Amino acid sequence: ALISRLGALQQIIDDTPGIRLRTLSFDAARNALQLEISAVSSQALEQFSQRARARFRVQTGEMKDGIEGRLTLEG
Amino acid sequence: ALISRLGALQQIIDDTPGIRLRTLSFDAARNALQLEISAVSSQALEQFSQRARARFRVQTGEMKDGIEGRLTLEG
């Protein structure tokens, strides 16, 4: 649930140009994985959001020379 | 660094009676993995701390019906 989802997420990050993992947090009790993404542009972040949405449950939101994305996955 | 260390950590958690992962956080920039452990007792948390210390760099500290451990790994 954690280890296997992490590999999938890392694959999508790695496959997606213009994206880096900035931070990641996991809460066992909520079985929730919170991800903060750095992106070169809004276009790159949308590339990533829809790839993540294709594999997992949900779009990536928020956003803050400096674009960030927030994907809370639940399982 | 993240994916491979996670599997090692999960092995030690799983091998150690009386321990559960409560939360986990990773900061890419510090290449730092923060772990919060729930334990049945101080004895279980010491069992875990020394296993983690054997594989990684550092002892697990803090502590807070409710014992917790904090292992910040750096890589």
PDB file of C-alpha atoms in Angstrom, chain A residues 2-3 6-7 10 21-29, chain B residues 2-3 6-7 10 21-29:
ATOM      1  CA  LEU A   2       2.889   2.338   0.824  1.00  0.00           C
ATOM      2  CA  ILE A   3       5.884   0.611  -0.786  1.00  0.00           C
ATOM      3  CA  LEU A   6       5.582   4.743  -3.936  1.00  0.00           C
ATOM      4  CA  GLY A   7       7.177   2.886  -6.861  1.00  0.00           C
ATOM      5  CA  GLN A  10       8.139   7.539  -8.569  1.00  0.00           C
ATOM      6  CA  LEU A  21       9.471  15.429  -5.752  1.00  0.00           C
ATOM      7  CA  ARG A  22       9.973  18.175  -3.108  1.00  0.00           C
ATOM      8  CA  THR A  23       8.384  16.458  -0.079  1.00  0.00           C
ATOM      9  CA  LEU A  24       6.326  13.415   0.770  1.00  0.00           C
ATOM     10  CA  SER A  25       4.354  12.592   3.938  1.00  0.00           C
ATOM     11  CA  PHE A  26       2.475   9.423   4.938  1.00  0.00           C
ATOM     12  CA  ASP A  27      -0.072   9.083   7.719  1.00  0.00           C
ATOM     13  CA  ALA A  28      -0.762   5.424   8.612  1.00  0.00           C
ATOM     14  CA  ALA A  29      -4.106   6.075  10.388  1.00  0.00           C
TER      15      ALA A  29
ATOM     16  CA  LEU B   2      14.208   6.765  -0.873  1.00  0.00           C
ATOM     17  CA  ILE B   3      12.658   3.613  -2.356  1.00  0.00           C
ATOM     18  CA  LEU B   6      12.075   2.468   2.689  1.00  0.00           C
ATOM     19  CA  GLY B   7      12.144  -1.292   2.053  1.00  0.00           C
ATOM     20  CA  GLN B  10       9.875  -1.533   6.557  1.00  0.00           C
ATOM     21  CA  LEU B  21       4.852   3.040  11.638  1.00  0.00           C
ATOM     22  CA  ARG B  22       2.651   6.032  12.630  1.00  0.00           C
ATOM     23  CA  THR B  23       3.972   8.653  10.174  1.00  0.00           C
ATOM     24  CA  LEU B  24       6.783   9.151   7.713  1.00  0.00           C
ATOM     25  CA  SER B  25       8.052  12.349   6.050  1.00  0.00           C
ATOM     26  CA  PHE B  26      10.718  12.861   3.366  1.00  0.00           C
ATOM     27  CA  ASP B  27      12.399  16.124   2.437  1.00  0.00           C
ATOM     28  CA  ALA B  28      14.238  15.903  -0.914  1.00  0.00           C
ATOM     29  CA  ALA B  29      16.481  18.969  -0.335  1.00  0.00           C
TER      30      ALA B  29
END
